[PDB]
Design a protein around this ligand. Sequence first.
Ligand code: K
Ligand code: K
Lengths: 9, 317, 317, 316, 316, 12
Amino acid sequence: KKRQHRKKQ
Amino acid sequence: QHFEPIPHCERVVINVSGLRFETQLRTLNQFPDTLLGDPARRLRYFDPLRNEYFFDRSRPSFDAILYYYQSGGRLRRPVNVPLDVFSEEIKFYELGDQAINKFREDELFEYPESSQAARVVAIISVFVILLSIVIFCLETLPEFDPFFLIETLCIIWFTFELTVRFDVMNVIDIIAIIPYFITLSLAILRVIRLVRVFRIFKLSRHSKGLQILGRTLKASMRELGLLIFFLFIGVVLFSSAVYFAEAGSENSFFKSIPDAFWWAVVTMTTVGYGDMTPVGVWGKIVGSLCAIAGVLTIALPVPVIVSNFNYFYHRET
Amino acid sequence: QHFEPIPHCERVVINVSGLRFETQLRTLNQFPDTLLGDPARRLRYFDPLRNEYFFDRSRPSFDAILYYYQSGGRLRRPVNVPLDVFSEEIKFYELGDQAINKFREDELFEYPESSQAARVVAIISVFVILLSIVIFCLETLPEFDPFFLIETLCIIWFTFELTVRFDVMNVIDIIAIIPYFITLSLAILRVIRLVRVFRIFKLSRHSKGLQILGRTLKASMRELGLLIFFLFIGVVLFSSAVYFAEAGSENSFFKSIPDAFWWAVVTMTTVGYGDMTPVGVWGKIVGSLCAIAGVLTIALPVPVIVSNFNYFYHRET
Amino acid sequence: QHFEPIPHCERVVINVSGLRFETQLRTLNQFPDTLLGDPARRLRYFDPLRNEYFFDRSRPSFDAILYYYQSGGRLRRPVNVPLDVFSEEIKFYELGDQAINKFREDELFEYPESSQAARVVAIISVFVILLSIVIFCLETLPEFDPFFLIETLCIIWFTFELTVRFDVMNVIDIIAIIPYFITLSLAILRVIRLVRVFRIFKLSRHSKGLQILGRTLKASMRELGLLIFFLFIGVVLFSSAVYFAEAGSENSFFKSIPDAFWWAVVTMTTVGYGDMTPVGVWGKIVGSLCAIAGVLTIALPVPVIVSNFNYFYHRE
Amino acid sequence: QHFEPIPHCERVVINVSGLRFETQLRTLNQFPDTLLGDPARRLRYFDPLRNEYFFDRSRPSFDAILYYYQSGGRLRRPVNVPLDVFSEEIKFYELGDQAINKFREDLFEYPESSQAARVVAIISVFVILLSIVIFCLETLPEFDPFFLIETLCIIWFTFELTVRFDVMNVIDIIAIIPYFITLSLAILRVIRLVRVFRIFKLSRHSKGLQILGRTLKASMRELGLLIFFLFIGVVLFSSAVYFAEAGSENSFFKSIPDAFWWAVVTMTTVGYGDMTPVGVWGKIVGSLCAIAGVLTIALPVPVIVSNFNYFYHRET
Amino acid sequence: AAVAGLYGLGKK
Ligand SMILES: [K+]
Ligand SMILES: [K+]
């Protein structure tokens, strides 16, 4: 979980 | 569903700062208006020497822009760039107000405001709400007119704020003052003195987190219903099992399946029933199974609500 | 395993809307049929002026299409585009029904319908199931013909529905009606009265979420077995430790190691045992270790189960 | 907000090992200094044969470099390359000390440093802290000069360390020794003998993980406050509900709503109250609802704190 | 740290199925051997008509392959392709066994079960389960017949151990040491307790148990952090609850250590049971203890969870 | 259980 993480994009 | 163009008039080349794009003119003809749709807004970018269209802008983001023409109505942001840069890219070509709006969803009266003079009004309302809650809790105490005066002052402030203001916020404001005027079979009295607690929900107007929680509940009502259904099924099953474990035993701990219902709950939620000795071996096995199944059936639905709350909380900030 | 062609007949160029691809004809001739596999379906896209194949479609998704030819049978969607674009991307070239189907796995009869006259039957069935559950839980009460008539009406409805209909749903329907006909040693009677509760599982036919839970359990049987095994190991170890901590003290709280099993359980799942005073310091240390290890062992395997539930829930919607 | 250039003098081509980039010179001259900003530092890479700029480096990472000129101040790392290659690539062109620094935020005196054989001092300090904690706990026992001597030795060591040393660490160091010197109504005495426990926080200077916990608390104070607010709302609501469910029954289990508060807590956190029999059916329903809502309100805000702690721990 | 080449002999062009790459020959000369490092293994791919290097393979994976030449020793897989294709791409160019191992790091029938030892294993599992059952049953109050089965199990265990001849062997030795010991009562109690270690022999036959052991070995640090946090919380909250109740007659807690257990069953949400004789301040301290316990358990455990998940998926 | 969290799969 990060900012603009691979899960989100 | 969208329509894609098919080949066989003339082909054109688009040079997005060295990345050459070649498409049929019919594809550019598909969407009227727009910078690239009509010659009027794109003639300035034509290069007479090279017969090419030059757009000295971001190269990786032009693929989605071309795919809009390619797919004829589909705009999806590729996962290689932040949303900030892509928002500016679509504005450059002016794809259309409807197109941009569709992608947006893809991801006195001074009281309802926040100014220098509205802040004191808000803090006064918060203090009054907290005072009303405190007076409620203390008037329920066994040690106890002095409470009635504070209660009626809070009610006058609440109704004054409601009248000045005039969804769900107004409904909560109304319900917070209905019971006071109701007082002006003891079951109805108990119900109204219970619904007096709804004044605590007036903090939603002044707390940002509480509104986030409300939005999360509204979004995940389906998951809440699924969790309640799973809990009900588990409670019924394990109550039946634990009752029939002691059915053949004398001096049964559980008189009936509904009696065991509470027990099942405090085992599915891992709260704990307390005294557990008079239960035999089979009841203990059923209890262990109930504990495991409760852990599972609580851990399954919650993460969806967790994700909804996280999304709402991070979208707020 | 897949076979990749090796170089040294003639080379051809593929132009995906400006993105030039060069590939040996032997690689293109590996796969028969298909838009590019045979000259019949790809001569229409030939450009006599430039001797090039022009494909005015999505640039980024052609890499996987060529890699399917390159690897000679290996096709995987790169993580740069959504699934909708890639699904339609393959249909353009018609790589083959078997190739597309293989990629899909990579990611009267008036009752089983949704007609206007079928929803009433479904609502009657679910109402009857709920009524049967209620009648069961009320007939088990100490305060109690009136229940037998309702039970036999529910059984008649269940048998009528089963006969009209005529996996696992049919097994559940059979089990929900076996015990009533069975009644027409006390251990067998207790077992049949217990298995009567399986009528609650008939809601799976009408509940979408319950089928999702069943599919999740079927998928994660292995993780469930792992969790049960870990629980058994922990229970045995900690029950033995806590029993041997009180071996040397008179009036031992635990008479034997099996006697302690229940305690261990309600400490691993954090349910709680209740009274804990007659336990010495070593027993308390063992209990603290048991609580920590139980938290860890119940936390370890459930991510997989909840991820499977998430996947099934999202696939359903 | 950032400003981007607009077209209409001469355009140039950049060849990043075969990936040709064509950009307007006005874009290149937007940022002074830098390898590409001035002709002095970029004439070396010019190719007279083809009039092209050759930069034999990582192709995928040049898009961010050009976009920085394109956006005129916005430099964002695309998610296609590791952090190591991007940090080295930007240093090649010397984008600017302020520019690189801005991107960094996007993602005796022997005691403080445990080097030069001073780790012995640290282990002695840890041993003294543990001994002080043990002596405190043992002196609270009913079975009990021998404790006072050890306690005052620990206090002398603590004050010697604090004085030779001379933030939150210093505040904790001072608080760990205030109560001993204070003792040289009984409510104040109870408060000081309670705050004497703050010597356990002295391990912060030596334990790396506890500093991570402190940083996580500082970062997620807002989420902790939100969790406390949710718990308070739920406790008040369910305490009122359960109390009013027992109003009409004689020998009520809960005498008042505040009395029920504690119960609500042990049902919201799923700890357990214990004896629960004298509660009627309505109270049992309220308790089940309280347990479920407590599970919900505990599970909602804890992932943020968990993520913050994980990020800090794995960054350390 | 790795070395990158610097410009000024002749530059060569690489055509990866239409994706043109241009690099300095010195960059390819940096690594000896390899398909592209030496002319012997790459002259076959030369195109005399175009003077180009043609490599009809996956285009997106050549960026990392070239970056290995570019970085002079750093090979990182970009997030655009699965790991299966990258392993095939690197094998084509034969970068080097040492280089590929970097990404790699990124009678006697008992171990290898082959048909007949597929039974021996089931007999061993059955014997282990039987020994556990005999242990638990002989601890019952109602109970030679148990000793015979115990000695048969020990005979089988020692036969297997001596035929076989890490940690599995250590556990096997421990599972039979106490039986041979029997051939102050504190030592007797200790050996009868350590007799339970026979339950760990299932590690040889259970795949999940080995995964759990590997997870513990990997996350020993996180386990220690969790234990430290729990200890700090227990000490703090036990001291607080003791001092919140010392001033009342007939105090529930006699001393801070006496409260330790309570603190534990409040941090882990197990529950203590009876809670009435504690006053308002004790109840507030207990609520704070419960909340802090939820936080301190939810903080480090997910790291161990992540380690276990990774090991479980790596096994399968 | 109050964890109810997946998070990143972990190191490599
Ligand atoms: K509990
Ligand atoms: K619990």
